[PDB]
Symmetry: D2
């Protein structure tokens, strides 16, 4: 009698269980950039969104759903209750507090810790086996906080870390050199941000080391000021925030790329933040960006880059800073 | 010599004439959704963004540029000056403010567009879209095949999604057309709704009427209201409109000749005698709209289109260019 | 210290389990067309190939593997031993014998049964939960054979059936109308091949019924002879075989499209062959093509097309003929 | 009134000109692998095939056309007559004479030269401004022949060169190290074939030089025998031919990737053969593979790789042997 039933004969009951589900936590501008980038690359057969702002959340979900004709991701869901995130292979954390003025660093972090104490247990409860990917800043610290709270082995807790900044570096490199970023290679490692380390000895096109051609590369004795590009990279995000208010598109694309490696088990190497106690001369429980092999089991291996003693010292300094801070957090 | 020249021997004096360039005018939430959707579909070898808000504009450009490693569009440019848009195949208009005001705005945007891309196709998304497509058309001087309104494209996609939810199948497999004037006055063509060539109206003759126990009529209402419901929740809409626009971009750039519910100057057809744009099923390719399907309409569906034409013309009569 | 261990520090011990594995059985031209199309649509994270021709098999695997740089499917495996197919979501059967001089078509069918008696139990053993998609001809009969041998519920055994033929029909429709195949709708249903049924009443563009515009559509009294469009469809495989000796590309593309719906749980409606006893007036255990909702559990629902009395008669006759052949096969 | 005219009202009476047309010359297994890969990457709005085997040609065209529903390339054409190739952006030559015996090299080349004397003039007649991409072996010599016959400037005449062999190298590299080929970097340069040059110095993951971790890399004294990996690349085509009779998929994928850089003006660096007189110590009109910037105007720039004296002389010798043969060609 009903039209559906007149039109369609049902032969199979529902067993409905997601096979490649991704959850994004937080629907601010970064969260939604990750979401659209992930939808348009067909990485998931289901997408879930969660946030505390219920109207905003429902709106974003609906807008995405109205695009269904143009996507190959058949199920998009959302809710404040984390049961909608259940059985995710990958859960991306973009939520957090924004540093107020006068706040102080340690105080900003703690407020983010307090948010994660609510988020992380809810993620783990409904997706015990997922990979966690943290994007919230400061990423290296907050990836640690998510690791400790979730109880997950280190291979399953990832920080986007320096992934986008390495992408920005390759872009600026390509602009100076007149070739596409895809063909330009450079690595930024360590602590996300201004303390991050541009590995000059690895920068090359077509296997041709720029440092071998141009020995001054990276020093202050450089007429071409290539050391500036790293600073350009670091500065360029705050430049963008100053211009449009925030950044979204690039980080979203960045995160989708990582998600691809994970969902398809590509085992590509990305500069991302991993718990590297024991490597790179690091002694504390700290996340730093190093070239990681990324696949369906998270970070399985790490490339041991050969660093100068200065570069090694930089990583140690950041490890001390990060640790000193984490030592003062309330969990 | 410079490091670049130690690394790279140049063999050709490079001339950059973009071959598959697309411009988005307006970097609001709609314009930027179009941009990112277009970028992720690999439709252009160059993207230009233009807006009057210079800081916002430069910020959006830089943000997209930073994602270059993950894209296949080698050049992204922007500026308030329209030289940056030069030689575009397709220029998508998302800027706007009424109507005589938009006329005044378009009186600046469109001639700037035509000056730097004399041969481009125009795609207007700005509301009220049927009227502004007419405006952009008159000011442009372009023949009608080259000026296109997003029209009922998204609302059809919304309708098809809601059809899919009700039937338990993907929107791709649910067919249905919303035509005419974009918005509250649009026409849900009940007679064409079908899955796998099976008319819903033939199975269920009450489809779309008040006596319809399933209230399919409310589905069209829900479509007409959905933008409003989404704005109420998040403040605006973006993703779906951007996706629907990139899909039109795709048919154009790849000369697909797919059929879309978009707004075209339909004088001479469907009984209309004025210069107005309404959504009908249009064949869309590298030359824009070259053909339209003649939907068989009920006598009152027809009178509904004629009414929208007189409504649009009534407004269009006033304006001055 | 090995170069690998010098370069890369291992942090995890992988027990590799494929999450979106597809297997193609038979690396003839049809099988390798399915394989390349599936690879270029990023539908799987692992591809396995099996065939009895061991050299040919290894050669195809290696050729595909040499392309890994340009693909996003990290693992391509092969072997005559079906352990390589273990834990496949989807297994595509293109293996078959070709007729000799010589033998009747029935005798040719039985030899394909004997081939399936070997393949199907091996497939089921290593992938108990997979869906089966049978492409080998005659496809309605061989899909039934696979159903029977496998013991799978009907929702999981799918025949490619009239999927390609409908695609061909839509292409020829679009050539006549000056519109892309994506916007021309029309269905070829029933038994794959000569006896297939062009459902004239369903043919439309933008929801405008051609039949209503042109009541002669598909009749002998039709001055535009649209029936010849169906005849072109029925003959197109033969025509391509006369010119190039076989067909590959189109069937491969049409199979990858079915694979997409399955791997991504899209629930798109495809004209494919399904066990339809109990529907469409059919009283026998036969597979015929009807519009099927295709997803991760295979065929969950079928659309009930309104058929004329003469159309129902063609289907029933097809069911009789199919069933008649099936009783004569040795299982 | 015809059904078409009842259904569709024509508003525009317009003409032809394809905007991103690609032509493939030769519908052997290589040309068709190029074609399907190009079709599935959405690189063209029109595809033309040409070959002297008219039935085969028409068969392949039809087979591809039947897959229209599943593609986004609206027009596929073919003909023995080159007018079908008019206004191509890019023309890919995969036609050539085969090997028999008693190779007076300047014979199975001079015969290819006589074949090109027919093809290339026809190509340039209908596409005066196309880029030429030669894949036929021997590729460095045949790219020179097409360059001479066409009258084209060197930037627009390209040979596939060592592009696939580098991809194979990066694949084998990935297998040894446990990471995807996309993250494994290495270049094979110079004369395509046995005499190609593995550039040991440039091989790396994430900017870490393997030669620097492992100085013996590439030498006979290499305990890990990485020299054999290059030899394995040089032999792989022969190994695959031995197994399946030819190679197709890998070369096709590699060629489509060059086509992408051209059609989208990506300016990526690929190891392809380019007329390198004046560079790398060479003074003759020959084509060798070096890292090239590839865009909408073909090869506009070359990367100058730092070579060992041993590597340099190896390239110089290749140049002289190529010229030695080219001298003896009758045009
Ligand atoms: O480096 C950037 O551009 C960058 C990185 C992270 C974020 C970010 C902002 C809010 C919430 C989560 C992440 N924004 C910008
Ligand atoms: O139907 C909608 O949701 C819809 C349509 C157009 C627009 C739109 C808004 C501003 C500028 C251009 C276009 N927004 C929403
Ligand atoms: O309709 C066609 O073109 C068509 C369909 C199936 C097959 C086919 C041939 C051998 C093995 C398996 C399948 N060939 C051609
Ligand atoms: O290296 C290879 O696998 C390889 C390269 C070229 C070709 C090739 C063969 C015939 C015509 C054109 C190109 N085959 C194999």
């Amino acid at each position: 009698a009903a039209l559906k039933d007149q039109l369609i004969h049902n032969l199979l009951k529902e067993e409905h269980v997601p096979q490649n589900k991704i959850t994004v936590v937080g629907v601010g501008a970064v969260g939604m950039a990750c979401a659209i980038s992930i939808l348009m690359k067909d990485l998931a057969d289901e997408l879930a969104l969660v946030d505390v702002m219920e109207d905003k959340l429902k709106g974003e979900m609906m807008d995405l759903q109205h695009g269904s004709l143009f996507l190959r991701t058949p199920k998009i869901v959302s809710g404040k209750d984390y049961s909608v995130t259940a059985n995710s292979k990958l859960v991306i954390i973009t939520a957090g507090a924004r540093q107020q003025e006068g706040e102080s660093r340690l105080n900003l972090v703690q407020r983010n810790v307090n948010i994660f104490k609510f988020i992380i247990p809810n993620v783990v409860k409904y997706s015990p086996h997922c990979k966690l990917l943290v994007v919230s800043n400061p990423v290296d610290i907050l990836t640690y906080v998510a690791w400790k709270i979730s109880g997950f082995p280190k291979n399953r807790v990832i920080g986007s870390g320096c992934n986008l900044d390495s992408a920005r570096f390759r872009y600026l490199m390509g602009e100076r050199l007149g070739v596409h970023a895809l063909s330009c290679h450079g690595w930024i490692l360590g602590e996300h941000g201004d303390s991050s380390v541009p590995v000059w000895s690895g920068m090359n096109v077509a296997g041709v080391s720029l440092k071998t051609l141009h020995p001054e590369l990276g020093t202050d004795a450089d007429k071409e000021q290539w050391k500036q590009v790293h600073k350009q990279v670091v500065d360029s995000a705050y430049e963008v925030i100053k211009l449009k208010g925030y950044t979204t598109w690039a980080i979203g694309l960045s995160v989708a790329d990582l998600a691809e490696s994970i969902m398809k088990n590509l085992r590509r190497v990305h500069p991302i933040s991993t718990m590297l106690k024991g490597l790179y001369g690091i002694k504390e429980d700290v996340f730093l960006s190093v070239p990681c092999v990324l696949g369906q089991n998270g970070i399985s291996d790490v490339v041991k880059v050969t660093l100068t003693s200065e570069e090694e010292a930089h990583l140690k300094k950041s490890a001390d800073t990060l640790w000193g801070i984490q030592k003062e957090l309330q969990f």
